[PDB]
Amino acid sequence: SRPLIHFGNDYEDRYYRENMY
Secondary structure (H helix, E strand, C coil): CCCCCCCCCCCCHHHHHCCCC
């Protein structure tokens, strides 16, 4: 995921997984 500060559930991970499968 990517920190965006995205209070606070971090659910966009799948679109910002530039570090994860």
